Design a protein around this ligand. Structure first.
Ligand SMILES: *[B]([O])([O])[C]([C]C1=[C][C]=C(C2=[C][C]=[C][C]=[C]2)[C]=[C]1)[N]C(=O)[C]1[C][C][C]N1[C]
Lengths: 219, 213, 234, 229, 209, 195, 215, 195, 229
C-alpha cells in the first residue's frame, strides 16, 4: 500500500505498488491498485481493500452514467464532490484514502481524498503505509512543470522508496499517465530480480491416497 | 498510556538437523511494526565450538538472553573445566527461561549442536522454559509458513517415501529454498540471511542474499 | 517518567570520512506548543563520544547525568589514553539501563543515539573537561549506536531516530555513500532536515550540527532555509 | 491551525495559516482555509477538516439558492453610477483582485449566511467558523460561529483555531478602533506569524483576504520570524 | 492434550497423545508427556507446557534427595502431596497444569490426579486434558479392572484414538506405558494413522459421521 | 445444559433427550419435561437450550410445517424440513438469540431416514450421530466406538443405554430420566428410560 | 473468519485444468468436531465452482443466495453464466452486508470461456483458469495461480509458494494440490479432518477424497 | 456447589455431605470424595467449596489441632476448635480467598455435643442445624419442620434420608451418594447412604 | 494561574497572579506564589497547589542545609567595601525592600537550588516551577522547571501557568535585550494583566518581586484592564 501521484506540465502521473497483505503476510505480489474512473481521470487508493474497490466501481459507473446524460467529458472536481459526500455519510467507517488525478477543461488537477470525507488539491502526494517514505523522496526532488519523462521516473523512485523502506509495500510498480487525449497504464514497470530461484520439484504421479474417486464426464 | 513492554521485531529462525550435522538459518532484518530499523541484525549467537542458539522474538530480550547464556556457559567452563554438552546447555536455558515465568522473555529460541560422535541435535522453546528435541523447527513470523514446508520434506504423508537419503549439500539447498519462500510470503522476513552448518569439525557462516521489500 | 509531555524531535547521525556528523533541531515542544526553541539535544559525554535525544526531555536530562558522572569516574581511574571508554562501551551501558527499566515499567521515554570514534589512534591524552588538520578514519573506527526505549540496540552507518526515521532514513538509504567529505555530508543532512520542516509539525529550523572528528567535538548553529515547491499560487 | 479576522475602517481582513496536520504529521501543506462562499463574503474554517469542508459545500448550495431567489424582477439603478498595495515588502506576496457586481441587490446579507451554520451544525459536529464579508446594510462585519453553533457578531476582531490563544493578548493590544488598510495588513500578518512561531499547528504560507465595499483582494505571504533578543 | 490411567488388574496403564499446539497452530507433534519422576513413579503433562514440565522435573529433584537421605523409596501419596503443595503457592500467578501421578509404592498401586490449584485426589481411572471427556467416556463403558495386559493397552489405545478423533487439540503419536511392581516399560511409542483401522477398516469412502 | 442425543441407521432414527427442567437454575422444576416437537409428516424436532426459547421456536416451526402440509397436500420432505428450520434459526440469529440446539430427524420416501444436527448458530449439517448440550462431550465417544454400519433398532437402544449410564456416572448433573423417539418401520415409537 | 468452525479452502491452476480443494471438518466449538462430510466446495455452474470457508451458518446462508441468483441469472438468460460475471457478483453480495458481514472467505474457481471462432468451422474455444480469492467484505484479490482462504490461509500460502509450478496437466496438478493441502492441514488443530480435492478439466470433473490424517 | 448438612441433638451430632468431586466442572471426577477431616479429640471438620482449598485449609487445621493436643496432653475443646478455625479462616480472608464452608462438630465433656456453622467469610456461630452449598436452599426446610427437641440418633438419620431424597428429586445436580458421620455415645460412626 | 519571569539589565523580575481556583471556584484569593527560598532567590510555583507547596517546604530545608554547609571558616573581605520607584502610578502598589548579606560567600547558587527539584520531582508529581535569583558567578538567571523535572536556563524570559499561553506572543514582541527597571516593570505588569483579562484563572492582586545584586523589592498591584476599542 504505497500510492502516489504528481502534477506535470500537461498531465498527471499516478504510481502505485503491487501488494495486498493480511497484515502479517502477503496475499499476492501483483494487485492493480490503480483504477479507471474515466478515460481522462484515474484514481488510486489505500485502506481496506473492500470499501476501496467497491467505491471506485461505484464512482466509475456513476461518472460514466453522468458522462452519458451529459455530453461532455467528466470533471475531476465532480468525482471529488461525489466521493467526499459518500465518505462523509459513513462517518469514518468506509476507510479508504484515495488519490484521484486527471485532466478536464481546467488544468491537470490531482486530489487527495481522506477516509473521513476531506479532500485537498495538491501538486503531488502519497498515501498508504509507505506514504511517509514515498513523500520524502517526492519533496526532495519535485519541481514545477516537470516533463512527462522526468516526472515518470521520479514516481519510480517515489514508489521504490516505499517499496524498500516499508514492510507493508512491495512488488512491482505500475504507472498511469492521464494526459488529455488518453491514458497510458503500464502494468509492470520495476522490481529487479536475481535471487535464489526455487527449483521446481513436482511430486510424482503415484502420490496421495484417494480412498474414493467419483469420476464423471459432463457435456 | 499503559506502556505495553512487548514488541515483536519479526524475523524467522529455521532449524533442520541431519544424521551427522544440523543447519541453523535465520534472517538479519530488524524491524519495527511496519518500518525497518536495520537490514543486518544477526539472530544467531554461537555458544560453544559445537552449539549455537537462534532466537526470533524481541531483540532487546534476545541480546540479553544470549548474553546471559554465554555468561553462564563461560562460567560453567571455568568452574567445571569442560565445555558443556548441548543437553547441559539446553536444560540450563530451560531454567533461565522459566526463571522469569511471570515476566517471560518475548523470545522463541532454537538450540542446535552435536553431542555424540556427530548426532546432530536440535531443541526448540516457546518463550517459557520448555524444550523438545526436534528434527526440524522454526520460530518467528515465518513459523506459520515454513513449518508446513519442513514437515512435507522431512517427515512424510507422501505415499512413497522418496529421498530417504539426505546429504548435507541438498539440505542446505532445501533451507535456502525454504528461507526464500518465507521471504517472499512474509512481511518481516529479512533481506540477508545467515546459514550455519554445525558439522563434525565446526560451524560455517556462509551467507545468502534475499529479497529487499 | 510517565508520558512524554516535553518532547524533543528527530536527531540524525551519519559518519563521514573525517568522523561522525550528528545534527538536531534546537526545539522542545510542550505537546502541540513550541514552549522552548533554544534547548540543545546533543550532549558531549566524552572527548570522543556524543549522545542523542528524542522524546521526553526530563528522562534524557536524567540520562545525561548518569553518562556524565560515568565519564568522570573513568577519568579519575584513567592512567593512559587507552583506558577511556569507547562509544560502544556507553552504548552497551545505555542499552543495559534502558533494559533494566524495561523489566520494571518506568522506561524513561527516549530514543537515545550514541555516536563517536571507537579508537585511540588520534591522540587526546590531555583531558580538559572544563574549557591543526583532520584525519581520515577508516569508518570501522566510528560507532553510531541506537537505543530504543524497549531496549532495542543496534549500530549502523547512519542512525536517524525520532521522526526522521521515515523521511531522513529514505534519503540516507539511497544517498549515503562511504567516505563522504565534510560539506557533502552537511548538504545531505541539510536536505534531510529541510524535509522534516515541511512534513513534521514538531520540528523547526535553527539546527545544531555537531561533528566528532579526530580533534574532538565541535558546535555551530545554522538556520537552514526551507522554501520550495511553489504552493503560493491561488 | 489559526484563523484571524480584523475589521478596519473600510473593510474586513481574513487571514489563516495553510496546514492540515494529522497528529504531529502534516497531511498537506498549503491547504485552503479562506473559502469563498459568495463574491462579497468569505469563510475561515477550522476544527476537524472533514466536517468544515462538508459544511462549506452545503452553505455554498444554500448561498446560491438564496442569491438568485432574492433577485428582484425588473431593472434598477437606471442612471446611478455610484462607485469609488504593500508592494512586496513582505517577500513573495502573491496577489490578485476581483470586483463585485455592485449595489448589492442580488447578493445576500452576511447575517443570512451566518445562521445557516447554526441551523446546520447545531449537531454533534466539531467545527468553528469565522464569517466575514461586505453587506449593503451593515457595512463590514465579522461573525464567529463557535463549536456548537454559537454566533456572536464581533465588531472588532475574531480569532479561532489552536494558535488563537497564543496571540489573544498580542492582538488585544495592537488593535485600534479605525485602522487603515496598511496598518490592518501588518497587524494581521504579524498576528499569524506570531501564532505560527510558537505553535506546532503553524502553517506554511499564510493567506490574507481583504473584503472591501467594491472588491476583494487576496494575498499569500511566504515568511518566517526571527526575534533579536 | 489427553491422558489416561487404569490401576487395572496387575498394574497401571498410562496413555497420552503427543501433540503440542499453541493457539490454533500445531507447534510440535512428537512431545513426550510421560516423565520418569522415579523408577516406580511416573507423571504426566497437561495444560500449560512449561508449568508442568518444569515442576515435575523439579519434583523429581525433591524425590531424589528424599529417596537418598532416607534410603527408602518415596510413596505416590507423598510424591503427590509434595507436588500439590508447591503448585498451591502459585494460585494467582496463572499456572495451568493437570498432572496424573501414577506409580507403585509399598502400599500397592497408587494414582493421584494433581491440578494447578492443589487439587490432590485418589482414584482409579483419572484422565486429564482438553479431550479428557471423550477419553473418560470410552473407559467408563469398557473398564473392568479384570482386564489382562494384552487388552488393557488395547483399551488405552482405543480411548486415546477416540479422544484425539473428537478433540482438535489432541493428536499425534500415542504413548501407552505400563507400571510394574518394579519399574515400568514402554509398551507403545506408537502412531496415530489408524483411524482406518478401528472403524472404517477399508479405505473406500469418507467415513460419514 | 440439557443433553440431546441422536443416532441414525439405515432403517431407523432414534432421538434421545433428558426429561429435566433446569429452570430456576438453583433447582429442577419438572422431572418429565417436553422438548420433542413431533411433526405430522413422520418428522421430529428436538430442541435444547433455554426452555423459554424452545417453546417460541419449536412451536413456530411446527405450525409453519403443518401449514405447508395443509396448503399443499404433500408431506414436507425431511431435507426441506431441516433446511427450512436452519433458515428461520439463522434469520432470527442477527435479530434475536434463540439459544436453541436442534436435532432434526425424520423419514423420507426418496432419502430414507435422515438425521440433521444444528447448533444455536445455524450450522445445519446431516450426520449419522449427533449430541447436544454439555453431555455431548461424554456421549459422543460411545456413539463412535459402539456404532457401526447397518445397525438394527434393538442394538441402537443398547447403545443409548450405554450413553445414559455414562451421564449418570461421570456427568456433573447426573441426569437420570431420558425420553426416546424411535422412528422405524413407518412408526414413531416413544419410550421412557431411567438410570 | 473464525476459529469456530475451522475450515480452509484451496484452489490451484494447471496447464489447462483447475483444482479446488477443501477440508471436510465441521467443528462446533474451536476444538470440537461434529461432522466430516461438510464439503465447502459448491457447484455454482458447469464451470463455476465456489469454495466457501468460515462460519458454517454464513457458508450455507451465502450459498443459498449465490445459488438463488446464479440460477435466476442463467434462467433469465438462456445462457451459461461465466466466472468473471459471477465473481464480481460475489464481491458485491458480500459488500452489501458491509456492516453485518457474512463471516466467510470465498474462493471462486472455474474456466473463463472465451468465444472466438477457434477455426473456420468451429464455434467456441479453449478455456482459461481464472482463480480468485476474497475476504469477508469482498475484496477481489484476483490471482493467476493458487488462491487460499480459511484458518490455514497462512499455512497454505507457505506450502503453495514452495511447491506450485507454472503449468501442469490433470494428473500432475492433483498431486501438488493434495500435498499442498494434506501437509498444511496436519499443521492445523482446528481443521483438516479429511480433504476433498476436486480437479476439473474442460471435458470431465474428477472428485477425490484423500486419506487425510484425522486428528 | 457441594452440599454439607449438619444436625445437632442433645446426645448426637450427625454430619452429612455428598461424596462428589465436581472438579473439571463439565463432569464429575470421583464418585467417593473425601471432605471430612476427623480430628483426634472426638472432633470433625466438614469443608465445602473448592476442592483445592479444602485440602490446603482442612489439612492445615488438622495438624495445628493435633499439634496442640500433643504439646498439651489435653484434648482441644470444641469451642476452642471452632473459634480457632474461624480465626485462621478470617486471618487468611484478606490475604487469600479460601472459598471453603466449614461445619464444625464435636463432643465436649463440659459443653456436650456442639455444632458450628461457618461461611467462607468467617461467620462462625453455634447452631442446632446447618446446611451449606446450593443444597442448603432445599434441605434447610426439612431440618426445621421435622426436627424437634431431644431427638434420638435413629430419627435424625431418618431426617437426613428425607433431605437426601429431596436433593435427588428437586436439586439441579441430583447428588445420589452421601456420607454421614454420626457422633454419639463416645463414638464416631461412619456410614454411606445412596439415593 | 499565571507566572512570569523577565531578566532585565541588572536583575530578574518575577510576577504572578494571586488566586487558587478549584474547578471554576476560587478556594481563596490572594494566595502567595512568589515564595522565598533564600535571601537572593525566589520561586514561582504553579500546577497542583498541594504538590508545589510541599516541594517548596523540602527545598527550603535543603537550601538551609546547604547554605550553612558552604560557609568558609574564617573572616573574609577584611577591608573591602564593595557596594552600590514607579511611585504608585499603578494604584495601590504596596511595597517594601530588604537588603542582602552581600559578597555572596554563604548563599548558594541558583543552579544548585534548581536541580534539587529534578532530583526531587523526577516523579509522578505535577508542578511546574520558575526559579529566579541573583548569583555570584552568573549574575542574574531564571530557571524554568517543567512538569517532569526538565530545567533549562532561560536567558530572556520564562512563563508558566494556565495563562502563559495568552501572553506567549505579547511578551515575545515587547521584549528587549537590556530593558531598564522601569520598562521591565511595565512589561511584566502588562503581561500579567493581559494574561488575567482573558483567563478564568485570573488572580486578584498581582505580586511582582524584583531580585537585584544587593536587594529584593516586592510589590503588590491592585488593578484591572479596560481596552478602548
Ligand atoms: B494440550 O494441548 O493442552 C498441551 C499439553 C502439553 C504439550 C506438550 C508438552 C511438552 C513440552 C516440552 C517438552 C516435552 C513436552 C507439555 C504439555 N498444551 C497446550 O496445548 C497449550 C496451548 C497453548 C500453550 N500450550 C501449548
Amino acid at each position: 500500500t504505497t500510492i502516489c501521484g504528481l502534477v506535470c506540465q500537461n498531465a498527471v502521473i499516478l504510481g502505485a505498488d503491487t501488494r495486498a497483505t493480511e497484515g502479517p503476510i502477503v496475499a499476492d505480489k501483483n494487485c492493480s491498485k490503480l483504477h479507471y474512473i474515466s478515460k481522462n481521470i484515474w484514481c488510486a487508493g489505500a485502506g481496506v481493500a473492500g470499501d476501496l474497490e467497491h467505491t471506485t466501481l461505484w464512482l466509475q459507473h456513476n461518472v460514466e452514467l453522468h458522462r452519458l446524460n451529459t455530453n461532455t467529458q467528466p470533471r475531476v472536481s465532480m468525482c471529488v464532490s461525489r466521493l467526499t459526500q459518500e465518505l462523509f455519510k459513513y462517518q469514518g467507517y468506509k476507510v479508504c484514502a484515495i488519490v484521484l488525478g486527471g485532466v478536464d477543461v481546467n488544468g491537470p488537477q490531482l486530489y487527495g481524498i481522506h477516509p473521513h470525507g476531506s479532500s485537498c488539491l495538491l501538486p503531488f502526494t502519497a498515501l498508504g503505509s509507505g506514504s511517509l517514505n514515498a513523500m520524502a523522496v517526492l519533496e526532495a526532488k519535485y519541481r514545477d512543470n516537470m516533463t512527462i519523462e522526468e516526472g515518470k521516473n521520479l514516481v519510480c523512485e517515489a514508489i521504490c522508496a516505499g517499496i524498500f523502506n516499508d514492510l507493508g509495500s512491495g512488488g512491482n510498480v505500475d504507472i498511469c499517465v492521464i494526459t488529455k487525449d488518453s491514458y497510458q497504464h503500464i502494468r509492470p514497470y520495476k522490481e529487479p530480480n536475481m535471487r535464489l530461484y526455487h527449483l521446481p520439484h513436482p511430486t510424482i504421479y503415484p502420490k496421495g491416497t484417494t480412498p474414493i474417486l467419483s469420476e464423471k464426464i459432463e457435456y | 498510556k499503559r506502556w505495553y513492554p512487548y514488541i515483536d521485531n519479526g524475523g524467522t529462525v529455521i532449524g533442520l538437523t541431519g544424521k551427522d550435522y544440523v543447519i541453523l538459518a535465520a534472517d538479519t532484518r530488524l524491524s519495527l511494526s511496519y518500518s525497518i530499523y536495520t537490514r543486518f541484525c544477526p539472530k544467531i549467537s554461537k555458544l560453544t565450538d559445537k552449539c549455537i542458539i537462534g532466537s526470533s522474538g524481541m531483540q532487546s530480550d534476545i541480546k540479553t538472553l544470549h548474553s546471559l547464556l554465554q555468561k553462564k556457559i563461560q562460567l560453567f567452563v571455568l568452574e567445571h573445566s569442560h565445555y558443556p554438552d548441548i543437553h547441559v546447555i539446553a536444560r540450563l536455558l530451560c531454567v533461565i527461561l522459566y526463571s522469569r515465568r511471570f515476566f517471560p522473555y518475548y523470545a522463541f529460541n532454537i538450540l542446535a549442536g552435536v553431542d555424540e560422535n556427530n548426532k546432530g541435535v536440535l531443541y526448540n522453546y516457546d518463550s517459557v522454559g520448555s524444550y523438545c528435541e526436534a528434527t526440524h523447527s522454526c520460530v518467528g513470523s515465518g513459523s506459520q509458513l515454513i513449518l508446513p514446508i519442513l514437515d512435507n520434506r522431512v517427515e512424510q504423508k507422501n505415499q512413497l517415501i522418496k529421498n530417504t537419503n539426505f546429504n548435507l549439500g541438498d539440505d542446505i539447498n532445501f533451507v535456502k529454498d525454504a528461507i526464500t519462500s518465507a521471504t517472499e510470503r512474509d512481511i518481516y522476513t529479512g533481506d540477508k540471511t545467515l546459514i550455519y552448518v554445525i558439522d563434525k569439525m565446526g560451524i560455517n557462516v556462509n551467507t545468502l542474499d534475499l529479497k529487499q521489500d | 517518567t510517565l508520558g512524554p509531555v516535553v518532547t524533543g524531535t528527530s536527531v540524525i547521525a551519519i559518519k563521514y570520512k573525517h568522523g561522525i556528523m550528528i545534527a538536531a533541531d534546537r526545539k522542545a515542544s510542550y505537546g502541540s506548543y513550541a514552549k522552548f526553541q533554544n534547548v540543545e539535544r546533543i550532549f558531549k559525554i566524552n572527548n570522543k563520544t556524543v549522545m542523542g535525544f528524542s522524546g521526553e526531555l526530563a528522562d534524557a536530562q536524567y540520562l545525561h547525568e548518569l553518562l556524565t558522572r560515568k565519564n568522570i569516574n573513568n577519568l579519575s581511574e584513567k592512567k593512559r589514553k587507552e583506558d577511556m571508554y569507547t562509544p560502544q562501551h556507553y552504548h552497551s551501558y545505555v542499552s543495559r539501563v534502558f533494559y533494566v527499566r524495561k523489566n520494571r515499567i518506568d522506561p524513561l521515554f527516549n530514543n537515545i543515539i550514541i555516536a563517536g570514534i571507537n579508537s585511540q589512534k588520534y591522540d587526546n591524552n590531555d583531558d580538559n573537561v572544563l574549557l591543526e588538520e583532520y584525519k581520515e578514519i577508516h569508518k570501522d573506527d566510528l560507532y553510531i549506536g541506537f537505543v530504543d526505549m524497549h531496549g532495542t540496540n543496534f549500530c549502523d552507518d547512519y542512525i536517524t531516530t525520532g521522526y526522521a526515521r521515515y523521511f531522513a532514513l529514505t534519503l540516507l538509504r539511497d544517498h549515503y555513500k562511504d567516505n563522504m567529505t565534510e560539506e557533502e555530508a552537511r548538504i545531505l543532512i541539510n536536505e534531510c532536515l529541510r524535509i522534516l520542516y515541511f512534513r513534521d509539525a514538531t520540528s523547526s529550523n535553527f539546527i545544531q550540527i555537531v561533528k566528532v572528528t579526530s580533534k574532538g567535538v565541535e558546535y555551530e548553529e545554522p538556520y537552514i532555509l526551507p522554501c520550495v515547491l511553489n504552493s503560493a499560487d491561488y | 491551525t489559526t484563523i484571524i479576522g480584523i475589521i478596519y475602517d473600510n473593510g474586513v481582513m481574513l487571514a489563516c495559516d495553510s496546514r492540515t496536520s494529522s497528529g504531529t504529521f502534516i497531511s498537506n501543506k498549503c491547504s485552503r482555509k479562506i473559502n469563498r462562499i459568495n463574491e462579497n463574503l468569505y469563510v475561515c474554517r477550522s476544527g476537524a477538516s472533514a466536517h468544515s469542508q462538508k459544511i462549506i459545500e452545503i452553505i455554498k448550495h444554500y448561498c446560491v439558492s438564496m442569491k438568485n431567489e432574492n433577485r428582484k424582477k425588473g431593472r434598477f439603478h437606471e442612471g446611478e453610477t455610484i462607485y469609488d498595495d504593500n508592494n512586496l515588502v513582505t517577500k513573495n506576496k502573491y496577489f490578485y483582485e476581483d470586483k463585485f457586481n455592485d449595489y448589492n441587490p442580488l447578493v445576500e446579507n452576511v447575517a443570512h449566511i451566518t445562521k445557516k451554520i447554526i441551523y446546520t451544525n447545531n449537531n454533534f459536529l466539531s467545527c468553528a467558523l469565522i464569517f466575514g464579508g461586505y453587506d449593503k446594510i451593515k457595512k463590514q462585519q465579522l461573525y464567529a460561529v463557535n463549536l456548537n453553533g454559537s454566533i456572536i457578531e464581533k465588531h472588532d476582531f475574531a480569532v479561532s483555531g489552536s494558535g488563537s490563544i497564543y496571540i489573544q493578548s498580542y492582538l488585544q493590544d495592537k488593535y485600534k478602533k479605525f485602522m487603515t488598510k496598511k496598518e490592518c495588513f501588518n497587524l494581521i500578518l504579524n498576528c499569524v506569524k506570531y501564532a505560527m512561531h510558537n505553535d506546532n499547528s503553524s502553517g506554511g504560507l499564510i493567506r490574507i483576504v481583504n473584503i472591501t465595499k467594491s472588491f476583494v483582494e487576496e494575498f499569500t505571504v511566504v515568511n518566517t520570524q526571527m526575534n533579536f533578543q | 492434550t489427553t491422558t489416561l490411567a487404569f490401576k487395572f488388574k496387575d498394574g497401571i496403564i498410562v496413555a497420552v497423545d503427543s501433540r503440542a499446539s499453541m493457539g490454533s497452530f500445531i507447534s510440535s507433534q512428537n512431545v513426550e508427556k510421560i516423565i520418569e519422576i522415579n523408577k516406580n513413579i511416573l507423571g504426566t503433562m497437561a495444560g500449560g507446557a512449561a508449568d508442568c514440565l518444569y515442576w515435575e522435573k523439579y519434583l523429581g529433584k525433591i524425590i531424589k534427595i528424599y529417596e537418598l537421605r532416607n534410603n527408602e523409596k518415596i510413596s505416590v501419596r507423598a510424591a503427590s502431596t509434595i507436588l500439590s503443595n508447591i503448585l498451591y503457592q502459585y494460585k494467582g500467578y496463572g499456572l495451568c497444569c493437570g498432572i496424573i501421578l501414577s506409580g507403585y509404592d509399598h502400599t500397592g498401586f497408587n494414582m493421584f490426579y494433581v491440578d494447578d490449584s492443589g487439587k490432590k485426589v485418589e482414584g482409579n481411572l483419572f484422565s486429564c486434558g482438553s479431550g479428557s471427556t471423550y477419553a473418560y467416556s470410552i473407559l467408563d463403558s469398557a473398564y473392568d479392572y479384570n482386564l489382562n495386559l494384552d487388552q488393557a493397552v488395547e483399551l488405552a489405545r482405543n480411548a486415546i484414538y477416540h479422544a484425539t478423533f473428537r478433540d482438535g487439540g489432541s493428536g499425534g503419536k500415542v504413548r501407552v506405558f505400563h507400571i510394574h511392581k518394579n519399574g515400568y516399560d514402554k509398551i507403545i511409542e506408537g502412531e496415530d494413522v489408524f483411524d482406518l483401522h478401528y472403524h472404517y477398516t477399508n479405505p473406500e469412502q469418507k467415513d460419514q459421521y | 445444559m440439557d443433553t440431546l442425543i441422536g443416532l441414525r441407521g439405515n432403517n431407523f432414527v432414534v432421538l434421545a433427550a433428558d426429561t429435566y427442567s433446569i429452570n430456576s437454575i438453583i433447582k429442577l422444576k419438572n422431572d418429565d419435561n417436553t422438548k420433542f416437537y413431533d411433526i405430522h409428516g413422520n418428522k421430529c424436532l428436538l430442541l435444547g437450550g433455554s426452555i423459554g426459547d424452545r417453546l417460541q421456536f419449536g412451536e413456530f416451526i411446527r405450525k409453519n410445517v403443518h401449514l405447508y402440509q395443509y396448503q399443499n397436500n404433500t408431506d414436507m420432505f425431511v431435507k426441506s424440513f431441516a433446511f427450512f428450520t436452519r433458515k428461520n434459526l439463522a434469520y432470527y440469529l442477527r435479530r434475536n438469540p434463540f439459544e436453541v440446539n436442534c436435532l432434526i430427524a425424520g423419514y423420507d420416501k426418496k432419502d430414507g431416514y435422515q438425521l440433521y444436527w444444528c447448533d444455536y448458530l445455524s450450522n445445519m449439517d446431516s450426520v449419522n450421530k449427533g449430541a447436544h448440550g454439555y453431555g455431548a462431550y461424554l456421549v459422543s465417544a460411545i456413539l463412535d466406538k459402539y456404532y457401526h454400519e447397518n445397525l438394527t433398532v434393538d442394538e441402537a437402544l443398547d447403545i443409548f443405554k450405554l450413553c445414559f449410564e455414562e451421564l449418570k456416572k461421570r456427568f456433573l448433573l447426573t441426569q437420570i430420566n431420558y425420553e426416546l423417539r424411535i422412528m422405524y418401520d413407518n412408526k414413531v415409537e416413544t419410550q421412557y428410560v431411567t438410570v | 473468519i473464525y476459529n469456530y468452525n475451522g475450515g480452509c479452502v484451496l484452489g490451484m491452476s494447471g496447464s489447462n485444468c483447475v483444482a479446488i480443494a477443501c477440508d471436510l471438518r465441521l467443528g462446533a466449538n474451536t476444538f470440537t468436531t461434529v461432522s466430516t462430510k461438510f464439503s465447502k466446495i459448491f457447484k455454482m455452474n458447469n464451470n463455476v465452482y465456489v469454495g466457501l470457508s468460515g462460519l458454517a451458518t454464513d457458508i450455507q446462508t451465502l450459498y443459498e443466495i449465490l445459488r438463488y441468483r446464479v440460477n435466476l441469472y442463467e434462467v433469465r438468460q438462456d445462457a451459461e453464466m461465466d466466472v468473471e460475471c459471477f465473481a464480481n457478483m460475489l464481491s458485491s453480495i458480500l459488500y452489501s452486508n458491509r456492516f453485518s458481514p457474512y463471516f466467510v472467505n470465498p474462493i471462486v474457481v472455474g474456466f473463463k470461456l472465451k468465444h472466438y471462432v477457434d477455426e473456420e468451422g468451429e464455434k467456441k474455444v479453449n478455456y482459461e483458469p481464472y482463480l480468485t480469492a476474497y475476504d469477508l467484505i469482498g475484496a477481489k484479490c484476483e490471482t493467476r495461480d493458487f488462491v487460499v482462504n480459511g484458518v490455514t490461509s497462512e499455512q497454505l500460502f507457505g506450502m503453495c509458494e514452495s511447491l506450485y509450478v507454472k503449468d501442469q496437466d490433470e494428473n500432475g496438478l492433483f498431486e501438488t494440490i493434495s500435498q499442498c493441502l494434506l501437509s498444511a492441514l496436519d499443521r492445523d488443530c482446528i481443521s483438516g479432518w479429511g480433504a476433498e480435492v476436486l480437479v476439473l478439466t474442460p471435458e470431465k470433473i474428477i472428485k477425490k477424497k484423500l486419506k487425510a490424517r484425522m486428528d
